[PDB]
Coordinates of C-alpha atoms and ligand atoms in Angstrom, one line a residue:
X1 CA -17.4 -62.8 -28.4
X2 CA -14.6 -60.8 -29.8
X3 CA -13.8 -57.3 -28.4
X4 CA -11.1 -54.7 -28.5
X5 CA -9.0 -54.5 -25.4
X6 CA -7.7 -51.0 -24.3
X7 CA -5.6 -51.8 -21.2
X8 CA -2.4 -50.7 -22.9
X9 CA -4.1 -47.8 -24.6
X10 CA -4.8 -46.5 -21.1
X11 CA -1.7 -47.7 -19.1
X12 CA 1.2 -47.6 -21.5
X13 CA 3.8 -45.2 -20.2
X14 CA 5.6 -44.8 -23.5
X15 CA 2.7 -43.6 -25.7
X16 CA -0.5 -44.7 -24.0
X17 CA -2.8 -42.3 -22.1
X18 CA -0.6 -42.5 -19.0
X19 CA 2.4 -41.7 -21.2
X20 CA 0.5 -38.6 -22.6
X21 CA -0.8 -37.4 -19.2
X22 CA 2.1 -37.7 -16.8
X23 CA 4.4 -34.7 -16.5
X24 CA 8.1 -35.2 -17.4
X25 CA 10.6 -35.0 -14.6
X26 CA 11.7 -31.6 -16.1
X27 CA 8.1 -30.3 -16.0
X28 CA 7.7 -31.5 -12.4
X29 CA 11.0 -29.8 -11.5
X30 CA 9.9 -26.6 -13.2
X31 CA 6.7 -26.6 -11.0
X32 CA 8.8 -27.2 -7.9
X33 CA 11.1 -24.4 -8.8
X34 CA 8.1 -22.1 -9.3
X35 CA 6.7 -23.2 -5.9
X36 CA 10.0 -22.3 -4.2
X37 CA 10.1 -18.9 -5.9
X38 CA 6.7 -18.1 -4.5
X39 CA 7.5 -19.5 -1.0
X40 CA 10.7 -17.5 -0.7
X41 CA 9.0 -14.2 -1.7
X42 CA 6.1 -14.7 0.7
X43 CA 8.6 -15.4 3.4
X44 CA 10.5 -12.2 2.5
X45 CA 7.4 -10.0 2.4
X46 CA 6.4 -11.1 5.8
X47 CA 9.9 -10.5 7.2
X48 CA 9.8 -7.0 5.6
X49 CA 6.4 -6.1 7.1
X50 CA 7.5 -7.5 10.5
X51 CA 10.6 -5.2 10.3
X52 CA 8.3 -2.2 10.0
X53 CA 6.2 -3.5 12.9
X54 CA 9.4 -4.0 15.0
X55 CA 10.3 -0.4 14.4
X56 CA 6.8 0.8 15.5
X57 CA 7.1 -1.4 18.7
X58 CA 10.4 0.5 19.4
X59 CA 9.0 3.9 18.8
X60 CA 5.5 5.2 17.9
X61 CA 6.4 6.4 14.4
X62 CA 4.2 8.8 12.4
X63 CA 1.9 7.5 9.8
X64 CA 4.0 9.3 7.1
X65 CA 7.2 7.5 8.2
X66 CA 5.4 4.1 8.3
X67 CA 4.3 4.8 4.7
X68 CA 7.8 5.6 3.6
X69 CA 9.0 2.3 5.1
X70 CA 6.2 0.4 3.3
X71 CA 7.2 2.0 0.0
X72 CA 10.7 0.7 0.1
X73 CA 9.5 -3.0 0.5
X74 CA 8.0 -5.4 -1.9
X75 CA 4.6 -3.9 -0.8
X76 CA 5.4 -1.1 -3.3
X77 CA 3.9 -3.4 -6.0
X78 CA 0.4 -2.9 -4.6
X79 CA -1.8 0.0 -5.5
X80 CA -1.5 3.4 -3.8
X81 CA -4.7 2.8 -1.7
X82 CA -3.5 -0.7 -0.9
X83 CA -0.2 0.6 0.4
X84 CA -2.0 3.2 2.4
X85 CA -4.1 0.4 3.9
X86 CA -1.1 -1.7 4.9
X87 CA 0.5 1.4 6.5
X88 CA -2.7 2.2 8.2
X89 CA -3.1 -1.4 9.5
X90 CA 0.4 -1.3 10.9
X91 CA -0.2 2.1 12.4
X92 CA -3.4 1.0 14.0
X93 CA -2.1 -2.2 15.8
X94 CA -2.2 -2.2 19.6
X95 CA 0.7 -3.8 21.5
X96 CA -0.8 -7.3 21.7
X97 CA -1.7 -7.4 18.0
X98 CA 1.8 -6.2 17.1
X99 CA 3.4 -8.8 19.3
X100 CA 1.4 -11.5 17.7
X101 CA 2.4 -10.3 14.2
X102 CA 6.0 -10.2 15.2
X103 CA 5.7 -13.8 16.1
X104 CA 4.2 -14.9 12.8
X105 CA 6.2 -16.9 10.2
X106 CA 4.2 -18.3 7.3
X107 CA 4.4 -22.0 6.6
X108 CA 3.7 -23.8 3.3
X109 CA 2.0 -27.0 2.1
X110 CA 1.1 -28.2 -1.3
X111 CA -2.4 -29.5 -1.9
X112 CA -4.2 -30.8 -4.9
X113 CA -3.1 -33.0 -7.8
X114 CA 0.6 -32.1 -7.5
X115 CA 0.5 -33.4 -3.9
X116 CA -1.3 -36.7 -4.5
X117 CA 0.1 -37.2 -8.0
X118 CA -2.8 -36.9 -10.4
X119 CA -1.6 -33.8 -12.3
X120 CA -2.2 -34.1 -16.1
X121 CA -0.5 -32.4 -18.9
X122 CA -3.1 -29.9 -20.3
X123 CA -4.8 -30.7 -23.6
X124 CA -6.6 -27.9 -25.4
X125 CA -5.1 -24.5 -26.1
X126 CA -5.8 -22.2 -23.2
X127 CA -5.8 -25.1 -20.7
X128 CA -3.2 -24.9 -18.0
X129 CA -1.7 -27.2 -15.4
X130 CA -1.5 -25.9 -11.9
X131 CA 0.2 -26.4 -8.6
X132 CA -1.8 -25.5 -5.5
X133 CA 0.5 -24.3 -2.7
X134 CA -1.2 -23.2 0.5
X135 CA 0.3 -20.6 2.8
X136 CA -0.5 -21.1 6.5
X137 CA -0.5 -18.4 9.2
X138 CA 0.0 -19.9 12.7
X139 CA -1.8 -17.7 15.2
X140 CA -4.0 -18.0 18.3
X141 CA -7.4 -19.8 17.9
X142 CA -10.2 -17.4 17.0
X143 CA -13.9 -17.6 16.7
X144 CA -14.7 -14.8 14.3
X145 CA -11.6 -12.6 13.6
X146 CA -7.9 -13.4 14.1
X147 CA -5.6 -11.2 16.3
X148 CA -3.6 -10.1 13.2
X149 CA -6.2 -9.4 10.7
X150 CA -7.7 -11.0 7.6
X151 CA -7.2 -7.7 5.6
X152 CA -3.5 -7.4 6.4
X153 CA -2.7 -11.1 5.7
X154 CA -4.3 -11.0 2.3
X155 CA -2.7 -7.7 1.4
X156 CA 0.8 -9.2 2.2
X157 CA 0.2 -12.4 0.3
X158 CA -1.0 -10.3 -2.6
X159 CA 2.1 -8.1 -2.3
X160 CA 4.2 -11.2 -2.6
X161 CA 2.6 -12.5 -5.8
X162 CA 2.3 -9.1 -7.4
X163 CA 5.9 -8.3 -6.7
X164 CA 6.8 -11.5 -8.6
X165 CA 4.5 -10.6 -11.5
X166 CA 6.1 -7.2 -11.7
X167 CA 9.6 -8.8 -12.0
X168 CA 8.8 -11.5 -14.5
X169 CA 7.8 -10.9 -18.0
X170 CA 4.9 -13.2 -19.1
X171 CA 3.6 -13.6 -15.5
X172 CA 0.2 -12.2 -14.6
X173 CA -1.7 -12.0 -11.3
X174 CA -5.3 -13.0 -10.8
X175 CA -7.4 -12.7 -7.7
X176 CA -9.9 -15.6 -7.0
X177 CA -12.3 -16.1 -4.2
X178 CA -10.1 -18.8 -2.5
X179 CA -6.6 -17.8 -3.6
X180 CA -4.2 -15.5 -5.3
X181 CA -3.0 -16.9 -8.6
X182 CA 0.1 -16.3 -10.8
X183 CA -0.6 -17.3 -14.4
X184 CA 2.3 -18.0 -16.8
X185 CA 0.6 -18.4 -20.2
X186 CA 3.6 -19.3 -22.3
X187 CA 4.4 -22.1 -19.9
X188 CA 0.8 -23.3 -19.8
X189 CA 1.1 -23.1 -16.0
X190 CA -0.4 -21.3 -13.0
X191 CA 0.3 -21.4 -9.3
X192 CA -2.6 -21.0 -6.9
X193 CA -2.0 -19.7 -3.4
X194 CA -4.8 -20.3 -0.9
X195 CA -4.2 -18.8 2.6
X196 CA -5.1 -20.5 5.9
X197 CA -5.2 -19.6 9.5
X198 CA -4.1 -22.4 11.8
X199 CA -3.3 -22.7 15.5
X200 CA 0.1 -21.7 16.8
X201 CA 1.1 -25.4 17.5
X202 CA -9.0 -29.9 11.6
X203 CA -11.7 -27.8 13.2
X204 CA -9.3 -24.9 13.5
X205 CA -7.9 -24.9 9.9
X206 CA -9.5 -21.8 8.3
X207 CA -9.4 -20.9 4.7
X208 CA -9.4 -17.2 3.9
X209 CA -12.1 -16.0 1.4
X210 CA -11.5 -12.9 -0.6
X211 CA -14.9 -11.3 -1.0
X212 CA -18.3 -11.5 0.7
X213 CA -20.2 -12.5 3.8
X214 CA -17.6 -14.8 5.4
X215 CA -14.0 -13.9 5.6
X216 CA -13.2 -17.5 6.7
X217 CA -14.4 -21.0 6.3
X218 CA -13.3 -24.2 8.1
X219 CA -11.7 -26.2 5.4
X220 CA -8.7 -28.4 6.1
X221 CA -7.1 -29.5 2.8
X222 CA -5.5 -32.4 4.7
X223 CA -8.9 -34.1 5.1
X224 CA -9.0 -34.5 1.3
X225 CA -5.3 -35.5 1.1
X226 CA -5.7 -38.2 3.7
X227 CA -9.0 -39.4 2.3
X228 CA -7.5 -39.8 -1.1
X229 CA -4.3 -41.5 0.0
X230 CA -6.3 -43.9 2.2
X231 CA -8.5 -44.5 -0.8
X232 CA -5.5 -45.4 -3.0
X233 CA -4.3 -47.8 -0.4
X234 CA -7.7 -49.4 0.0
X235 CA -8.7 -49.7 -3.6
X236 CA -5.3 -50.0 -5.2
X237 CA -2.7 -48.5 -7.6
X238 CA -5.3 -48.1 -10.3
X239 CA -7.3 -45.5 -8.5
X240 CA -4.8 -42.7 -9.4
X241 CA -4.8 -43.9 -13.0
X242 CA -8.6 -43.9 -13.5
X243 CA -8.8 -40.5 -11.7
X244 CA -6.3 -39.2 -14.3
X245 CA -8.3 -40.7 -17.1
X246 CA -11.6 -39.1 -15.9
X247 CA -9.9 -35.7 -15.7
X248 CA -8.5 -36.2 -19.2
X249 CA -12.0 -36.9 -20.4
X250 CA -13.2 -33.7 -18.8
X251 CA -10.4 -31.7 -20.4
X252 CA -11.3 -33.2 -23.8
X253 CA -15.0 -32.6 -23.5
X254 CA -14.8 -29.0 -22.2
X255 CA -12.4 -26.3 -23.3
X256 CA -13.6 -24.3 -20.3
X257 CA -15.8 -25.9 -17.6
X258 CA -16.9 -29.4 -16.8
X259 CA -17.1 -31.0 -13.3
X260 CA -14.5 -30.3 -10.8
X261 CA -11.5 -32.6 -10.4
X262 CA -12.5 -33.3 -6.7
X263 CA -16.0 -34.2 -7.8
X264 CA -14.7 -36.8 -10.3
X265 CA -12.3 -38.2 -7.6
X266 CA -15.1 -38.5 -5.0
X267 CA -17.6 -40.2 -7.4
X268 CA -14.9 -42.6 -8.7
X269 CA -13.8 -43.7 -5.2
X270 CA -17.5 -44.3 -4.3
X271 CA -17.9 -46.5 -7.4
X272 CA -14.7 -48.5 -7.0
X273 CA -15.5 -49.0 -3.3
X274 CA -18.9 -50.5 -4.1
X275 CA -18.7 -52.1 -7.5
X276 CA -16.7 -55.2 -8.6
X277 CA -13.9 -54.4 -11.1
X278 CA -10.6 -55.8 -12.4
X279 CA -7.4 -53.9 -12.3
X280 CA -5.9 -56.2 -14.9
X281 CA -8.3 -54.7 -17.4
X282 CA -8.6 -50.9 -17.0
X283 CA -10.6 -50.7 -20.2
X284 CA -13.3 -52.7 -18.5
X285 CA -12.8 -50.8 -15.2
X286 CA -13.3 -47.5 -17.1
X287 CA -16.5 -48.8 -18.7
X288 CA -17.7 -49.8 -15.2
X289 CA -16.9 -46.3 -13.8
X290 CA -18.6 -44.7 -16.8
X291 CA -21.7 -46.8 -16.3
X292 CA -22.1 -45.6 -12.7
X293 CA -21.0 -41.9 -12.9
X294 CA -24.4 -40.5 -14.1
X295 CA -26.2 -41.9 -11.0
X296 CA -23.4 -40.5 -8.7
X297 CA -23.7 -37.0 -10.2
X298 CA -27.5 -37.0 -10.5
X299 CA -27.9 -37.5 -6.7
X300 CA -25.2 -34.9 -6.0
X301 CA -21.6 -35.7 -5.2
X302 CA -20.8 -35.3 -1.5
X303 CA -17.5 -34.0 -0.2
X304 CA -15.2 -36.4 1.6
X305 CA -15.1 -33.7 4.2
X306 CA -18.3 -34.6 6.1
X307 CA -18.3 -31.1 7.8
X308 CA -18.9 -29.6 4.3
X309 CA -22.5 -29.7 3.5
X310 CA -22.1 -28.0 0.2
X311 CA -22.0 -30.7 -2.5
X312 CA -19.1 -31.0 -4.9
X313 CA -21.7 -31.2 -7.7
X314 CA -25.3 -30.4 -7.1
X315 CA -28.3 -32.9 -7.2
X316 CA -30.6 -32.9 -10.3
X317 CA -33.2 -30.5 -8.9
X318 CA -30.5 -27.7 -8.8
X319 CA -29.3 -28.1 -12.3
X320 CA -28.9 -25.3 -14.8
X321 CA -27.6 -25.5 -18.4
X322 CA -24.0 -26.3 -17.3
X323 CA -25.0 -29.2 -15.0
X324 CA -27.4 -30.5 -17.6
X325 CA -24.5 -30.5 -20.1
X326 CA -22.3 -32.3 -17.7
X327 CA -25.0 -35.0 -17.2
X328 CA -25.4 -35.3 -21.0
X329 CA -21.7 -35.9 -21.5
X330 CA -21.5 -38.3 -18.6
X331 CA -24.4 -40.3 -20.1
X332 CA -22.6 -40.4 -23.5
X333 CA -19.3 -41.7 -22.1
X334 CA -20.3 -45.4 -21.4
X335 CA -21.8 -45.4 -24.9
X336 CA -18.5 -44.2 -26.5
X337 CA -16.6 -46.8 -24.6
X338 CA -18.9 -49.6 -25.6
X339 CA -18.9 -48.6 -29.2
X340 CA -15.1 -48.5 -29.2
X341 CA -15.0 -52.0 -27.8
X342 CA -17.0 -53.4 -30.7
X343 CA -15.6 -51.3 -33.5
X344 CA -14.9 -52.9 -36.9
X345 CA -11.2 -52.3 -36.8
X346 CA -8.4 -51.1 -34.6
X347 CA -8.3 -47.8 -36.4
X348 CA -12.0 -47.2 -35.8
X349 CA -11.6 -48.4 -32.2
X350 CA -9.0 -45.7 -31.7
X351 CA -11.0 -43.1 -33.4
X352 CA -14.0 -43.9 -31.2
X353 CA -12.3 -44.0 -27.8
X354 CA -10.5 -40.8 -28.7
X355 CA -13.9 -39.1 -28.8
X356 CA -13.8 -39.6 -25.1
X357 CA -10.2 -38.7 -24.3
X358 CA -9.2 -36.6 -27.2
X359 CA -6.8 -37.3 -30.0
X360 CA -3.8 -37.8 -27.8
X361 CA -3.0 -41.4 -28.2
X362 CA -2.2 -42.2 -31.9
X363 CA -0.7 -45.7 -31.6
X364 CA -3.5 -48.1 -32.5
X365 CA -1.2 -51.1 -31.8
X366 CA -1.9 -50.4 -28.1
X367 CA -5.4 -51.8 -28.9
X368 CA -5.4 -55.6 -29.1
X369 CA -8.0 -58.2 -30.2
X370 CA -9.5 -60.0 -27.2
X371 CA -12.4 -62.0 -26.0
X372 CA -14.9 -60.9 -23.3
Ligands
3AT1 N1 -15.2 -27.9 -3.4 C1 -14.1 -28.2 -2.6 N2 -14.2 -28.6 -1.4 C2 -13.1 -28.9 -0.6 N3 -11.8 -28.8 -1.1 C3 -11.6 -28.4 -2.3 C4 -12.7 -28.0 -3.2 N4 -12.2 -27.6 -4.4 C5 -10.9 -27.7 -4.2 N5 -10.5 -28.2 -3.0 C6 -9.2 -28.4 -2.4 O1 -8.2 -27.8 -3.3 C7 -7.3 -28.8 -3.9 C8 -7.0 -28.4 -5.3 O2 -8.2 -28.3 -6.1 P1 -8.2 -28.4 -7.7 O3 -7.1 -27.6 -8.4 O4 -9.6 -28.1 -8.2 O5 -8.1 -30.0 -7.9 P2 -6.8 -30.9 -8.2 O6 -7.0 -32.1 -7.5 O7 -5.5 -30.0 -8.0 O8 -7.0 -31.1 -9.8 P3 -6.4 -30.4 -11.1 O9 -5.3 -31.4 -11.6 O10 -5.8 -29.0 -10.8 O11 -7.5 -30.2 -12.1 C9 -8.0 -30.1 -3.7 C10 -8.8 -29.9 -2.4 O12 -8.0 -30.1 -1.3
3AT2 N1 -13.0 -25.6 0.4 C1 -12.7 -25.1 -0.8 N2 -13.6 -24.7 -1.7 C2 -13.3 -24.2 -2.9 N3 -12.0 -24.0 -3.3 C3 -10.9 -24.4 -2.5 C4 -11.2 -25.0 -1.2 N4 -10.1 -25.3 -0.7 C5 -9.1 -25.0 -1.5 N5 -9.6 -24.4 -2.7 C6 -8.8 -23.9 -3.8 O1 -9.6 -23.6 -5.0 C7 -8.8 -23.9 -6.2 C8 -9.8 -24.2 -7.3 O2 -11.0 -23.5 -7.1 P1 -11.8 -22.8 -8.2 O3 -12.1 -21.4 -7.7 O4 -13.0 -23.7 -8.7 O5 -10.8 -22.6 -9.5 P2 -11.1 -23.2 -11.0 O6 -11.4 -24.7 -10.9 O7 -10.1 -22.6 -11.9 O8 -12.6 -22.5 -11.3 P3 -12.8 -20.9 -11.4 O9 -11.4 -20.3 -11.7 O10 -13.3 -20.5 -10.0 O11 -13.8 -20.7 -12.5 C9 -7.8 -25.0 -5.8 C10 -7.7 -24.9 -4.3 O12 -6.4 -24.3 -4.1
MG3 MG1 -4.9 -28.2 -9.0

């Protein structure tokens, strides 16, 4: 009953997979420095725009003079039509709207894998690590439209990010449906900035959407943060590790694409909550996760936010080529792991398990002969 054991292959912080995935302190500090840069500029742009609104409260300035004031701020890094729109929105505000804007100071909170500590070093060329830093606009509760304006809020956050891109060589701006993004290719890094409306201080946490039908959706990122932290407490310290490993698998199997990180987390928590496993052998634990993921994904992976009816990964009847590919690779994973376990030699064991996680771990002495 001889096997190969991979517990150190997975967990070793020198040169096992944890060692290869976890950011160095310098890398983490660089991301925190990037976050601060964005936060300070967003703060500044809002103070600048408020200064113009303050002037208009004092005196009903002409549109031309408001434009001139806009053009001397960071908003100058938007397009001509975008600057005109900002000036027009400030010109068009009634007294109550203007007073609400003059009271607005954006707040910030990091979400995603930087926040709950599952951010992996990227693997393939082109792949990037990111930090997701949300900007929050405290304002009165609204049903349909806020008393400051979706359009103005997005223009000002865009102005912030674009002003930074203009000042930093090798930085590039990208608009997404749920965020503005600064990409820094040479640093294999981007920062995503989702924007939320919240009350002036979960049902009233509203994510801004860039294009389409709905300008807002109720999506409180703290629901996911709290669910995952609670899950780590409930299941144990290995949950963060196996979530990292499943994301590393995804990065190795797909250059571009694959299932979302949050779908992997949700399915893995469901499996570990409901299936016996042993944290002293994370090789066996990974095999157990891999055996059960196909069924989790085939039925559709539900969001931990119960108010979100949209699945994190759709059920089988809604699959196209991409979802079919994901199912195929999920089905292959337990077979890869099983073959690695019974390989003829340590070097073949390493070669095989690296077909799941990529050729990152090279130290075959992390794999030891065992019985199972
Ligand atoms: N479909 C979704 N439903 C609800 N929240 C989502 C969804 N996709 C992303 N989020 C929110 O955004 C956060 C960041 O997402 P994302 O960058 O995809 O994951 P992550 O956990 O940061 O993993 P990576 O390490 O970046 O791959 C996590 C969650 O609070
Ligand atoms: N409820 C939500 N639904 C979707 N995305 C969300 C939600 N809440 C926050 N986000 C933001 O979306 C970001 C990742 O979304 P996504 O648009 O899938 O980027 P991606 O994973 O690079 O894929 P694409 O760039 O869209 O192909 C991370 C997070 O900051
Ligand atoms: Mg992220």
